């Protein structure tokens, strides 16, 4: 009974050059699930990131 | 090779070299040095012209 | 539904001196189907070459 989910898929920059068989070479989504604060680190750039 | 797929040493320095340009790809010695990267993309199909 | 290949065939270095029986010894072309990345290496000349 959760709320309806909608998303727009982009298939741009896809080539069909007959490279043998069919296989997915790229997959990504921006809809991250909720997460818990694991830890944080400091990189040389001076920023702070919580993972 | 890091996640950006670049020729990098253990400290974070980007190796530089002459970029390979042209069709077919070739290395020109008169170009400005550029970072050397190894893309995951596949080369496009070639139309036969000389046999 | 693809464009026809406009190529030129040259029978360079052809000799007729009764060489045994009719046969071929060389074949050169610039036609190849695209492939996937397998391995990367660097030669002693410094040029980076992928296979």
Swiss-Prot record, chains A, C:
Cleaved signal peptide residues: none
Q: What's the family?
A: Belongs to the flagella basal body rod proteins family.
Provenance organism? Salmonella typhimurium (strain LT2 / SGSC1412 / ATCC 700720)
From the Swiss-Prot or TrEMBL record, give the protein name.
Flagellar hook protein FlgE
Compartments (UniProt record): Bacterial flagellum basal body
């Amino acid at each position: 009974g959760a709320t309806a989910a909608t998303f727009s898929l982009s298939f741009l920059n896809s080539m069909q050059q007959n490279t043998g068989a069919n296989n997915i070479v790229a997959t990504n989504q921006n809809g991250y699930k909720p997460g818990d604060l694991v830890s944080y680190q400091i990189n040389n750039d001076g920023t702070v990131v919580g993972n | 090779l890091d996640e950006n797929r670049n020729l990098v040493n253990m400290q974070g320095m980007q190796l530089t070299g002459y970029p390979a340009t042209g069709t077919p790809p070739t290395i020109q010695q008169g170009a400005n040095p550029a970072p050397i990267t190894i893309p995951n993309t596949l080369m496009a199909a070639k139309s036969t012209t000389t046999a």
